[PDB]
Amino acid sequence: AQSVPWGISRVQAPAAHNRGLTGSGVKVAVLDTGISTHPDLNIRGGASFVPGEPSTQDGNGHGTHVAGTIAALNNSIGVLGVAPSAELYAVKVLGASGSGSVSSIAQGLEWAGNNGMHVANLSLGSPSPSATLEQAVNSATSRGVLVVAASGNSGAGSISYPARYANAMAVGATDQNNNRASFSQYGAGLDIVAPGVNVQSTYPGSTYASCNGTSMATPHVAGAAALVKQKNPSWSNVQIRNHLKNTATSLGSTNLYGSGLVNAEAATR
Ligand SMILES: *Cc1ccc(-c2ccc(C)cn2)nc1
Ligand SMILES: [Ca+2]
Numbered sequence: 184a185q186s187v188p189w190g191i192s193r194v195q196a197p198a199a200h201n202r203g204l205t206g207s208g209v210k211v212a213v214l215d216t217g218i219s220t221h222p223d224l225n226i227r228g229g230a231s232f233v234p235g236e237p238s239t240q241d242g243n244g245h246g247t248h249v250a251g252t253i254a255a256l257n258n259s260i261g262v263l264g265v266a267p268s269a270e271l272y273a274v275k276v277l278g279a280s281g282s283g284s285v286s287s288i289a290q291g292l293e294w295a296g297n298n299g300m301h302v303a304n305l306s307l308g309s310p311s312p313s314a315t316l317e318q319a320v321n322s323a324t325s326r327g328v329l330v331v332a333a334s335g336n337s338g339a340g341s342i343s344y345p346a347r348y349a350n351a352m353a354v355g356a357t358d359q360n361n362n363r364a365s366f367s368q369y370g371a372g373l374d375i376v377a378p379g380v381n382v383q384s385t386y387p388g389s390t391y392a393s394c395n396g397t398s399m400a401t402p403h404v405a406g407a408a409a410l411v412k413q414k415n416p417s418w419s420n421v422q423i424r425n426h427l428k429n430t431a432t433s434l435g436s437t438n439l440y441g442s443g444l445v446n447a448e449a450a451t452r
Contacts (some may be wrong), residue, residue: 187263189359190378191416194403195448196265196451199410204451206266206409208416211253211302212328213402214291215246216281219387220378226229229273232290242279244387248394249306251385252402253409262383262391265406265447266413272300277307287396288345289319295325301382301412301420304405305332306398308343314423317359324350329420331405334398335368347372352424355440356380356400363439367397373441374424375431377403406414407447426450448451 187197199205210227218226219241229239241247250271257267257419276291277283288307292300295303303323320330334355335343346353349372356367356379363369379400406425411423418426430444430449 185259185261188383189267190382190403191263193378194196194265194407195447196406198448199451202451204268204410204413205257206254206406206413209266209269209302209409209412210272210300210408211266211269211304211405211440212272212274212290212295212300212354213246213253213304214274214276214288215247215249215306216279217241217275217276218250219247221247221357221385221389223255223385225256225271226273227270229275230294231275232287233275233278234273236275236278239273239275241387243277243281245281245306245398246273247387248384248392249304249398249402252382252399252446253304253406255385262385265403266409269406269409285313285315289315291322292319296330300331301326302331302405302408304402305330305345306401308333308346311345312344317348320345320348320350324420327420329408329423331401331408333401334373335450336366337368337394339368340370342368342372343368344447352404353441354397354401356397357434357444361434361444364395369439375404375428375441375445376434376443377445404445405443407450410447411450414429
């Protein structure tokens with residue numbers, strides 16, 4: 184039996200699916216701890232930039248969880264992603280510890296721009312800027328990648344890098360009441376929000392687990408971007424980002440929420 188995590192319903196992905204929009208033909212890179220083989224995921228390819236972890240399999244869990252929110256398969260098992268037919272790529276930039284470097288992350292972004300990715304999900308960040316990372320965000324953007332990044336979990340009224348950069352789409356987290364999750368960073372540069380509390384997704388060991396974080400919000404938006412791209416194949420990264428923002432539901436505060444709650448039904452109408 185398959186069940187639909189609450190956040191998938193909250194972003195109105197099933198309405199898009201009913202219109203035949205699933206993310207088919209859209210390439211989405213998950214720049215994370217890897218993605219493990221799982222019966223509810225279809226991993227097309229990828230690369231590792233973590234020395235000593237030459238495989239793209241996930242030794243942490245976080246990247247597999249993020250991947251399932253984007254693209255868990257629509258079938259009779261497990262869960263269901265926002266964009267269940269997205270073409271998923273495992274771009275390992277963080278090790279099994281959950282840590283990486285700005286160089287590794289930059290290499291993953293360069294890979295995304297050299298391999299035709301439409302969307303890159305970066306459920307990662309840090310309070311400090313990085314020239315290395317910024318250059319790579321800008322380069323990937325110039326190659327047509329929509330970079331979607333988590334605002335961070337410190338609870339502060341400023342957001343992490345790379346989400347803070349103009350060429351990243353910064354995603355904060357909401358709860359079941361459509362309030363900002365207490366940990367979700369907000370403020371200048373925040374673009375949009377999505378569910379990030381009690382998010383069930385795929386997890387290594389061929390199982391499922393629930394997590395909290397702006398890391399869980401981000402892939403809802405990455406998946407929504409893939410739905411928009413399937414509907415509008417000619418559109419650029421900027422056009423997709425703008426349309427997601429323009430069709431988001433206001434949550435009553437730009438400071439806190441950016442454009443508001445992503446809405447895949449309104450974005451694919
Ligand atoms: C510091 C830290 C620890 C754990 C995580 C995490 C693990 C697993 C899942 C599903 C979500 N988040 N993030 C940051
Ligand atoms: Ca499934």
